[PDB]
Amino acid sequence: FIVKATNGPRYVVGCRRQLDKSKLKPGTRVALDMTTLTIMRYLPREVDPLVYNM
Amino acid sequence: DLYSRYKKLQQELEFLEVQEEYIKDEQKNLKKEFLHAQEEVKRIQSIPLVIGQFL
């Protein structure tokens, strides 16, 4: 799975066991471990609270 | 002068059959060490990858 976090470079990791890979459409926002760096949990999309203040 | 001849060359022949049997299993065990080397090669890419581009 090819993911690019917002903070920098690109990475290639895999799921844990039960991450239900059909959920991962290209462009979804997911979670990653800090050390092992594999995928943990599919997450809902960002809100960018500059939107929320308006 | 004959009896000296097969007292050398028979011993040569059985020594050579000794190592001819050994070298087969030698070359066998080298492939197992080679498969260990293969797994040592394969495990260089499992959990990470850090994408760059070739310059």
Cβ distance B51 to A10 less than 8 Å, yes or no, reads: yes
Q: Are strands A2-4 and A10-12 parallel, antiparallel or unpaired?
A: antiparallel
CA distance B34 to A12: 28
CA distance B52 to chain A (A): 8
Residues with Cβ within 8 Å of residue A12, at least 6 apart in sequence: A1, A2, A3, B48, B49, B51
CB contact under 8 A, B49 and A11: yes
What are the tokens at A3? 């993911």
Closest CA–CA distance from residue B39 to any residue of chain A (Å): 20
Q: Which two tokens stand for residue B32?
A: 């197992």
- Give the rounded distance of the alpha carbon of B33 from its chain centre: 8
In which element (H, E) is residue B41 found? Answer: helix B5-42
3-state class (DSSP) for residue A14: coil
Task: Indicate yes or no: CB of B48 within 8 angstroms of CB of A9.
Answer: no
Q: Which residues contact A40 (CB under 8 A, 6 or more apart)?
A: A16, A19, A30, A31, A32, A33
Distances (CA, A) of B16 to A3, A51, B9, B20, B22: 61, 86, 10, 6, 10
Reading the block at residue B30, the tokens are 């080298």
Hey, which residues does A11 pair with through a beta bridge?
A: A3, B50
How far apart are the C-alpha atoms of A43 and A2, rounded to whole Å?
16
> Could you give the CA distance from residue B28 to residue A15 in angstroms, rounded to a whole number?
39
Among candidate residues A3, A11, A8, A9, the one with its CA nearest the CA of residue A30: A3
Burial-class residue B43 by CB neighbours within 10 Å (0-12, 13-18, 19+).
Answer: exposed
Experimental method: cryo-EM
